[PDB]
Amino acid sequence: YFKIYSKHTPINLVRDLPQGFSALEPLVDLPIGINITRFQTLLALHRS
């Protein structure tokens, strides 16, 4: 089972993580049934 929990939080701090409490709601459970040992973030370029 692949559990994805998520939370959206409105913050106004400039640099670091804000200090506070926010419990993450369960968003979606995925029936994947596969081995995962590595991950990589996906970003977006800005072209001009």
């Binding site: 089972y1 029936p31 994947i32 049934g33």
Partner: protein, 49 residues
């Protein structure tokens, strides 16, 4: 294929459904039915397992 053929030569559309169980979580389930909810009585309830 022609429409005037015998029953042993007429075209037959065949669909073969193959059901396998793998170690991944099984997700193609049948439609479980829903017995009409009864309130205010001592009943045996089964809600989502």
């Amino acid at each position: 294929f022609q429409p005037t053929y015998g029953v042993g030569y007429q075209p037959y559309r065949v669909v073969v459904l193959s059901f396998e169980l793998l170690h991944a979580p099984a997700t193609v389930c049948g439609p479980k039915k829903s017995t009409n909810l009864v309130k205010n009585k001592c009943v045996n309830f089964n809600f989502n397992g």
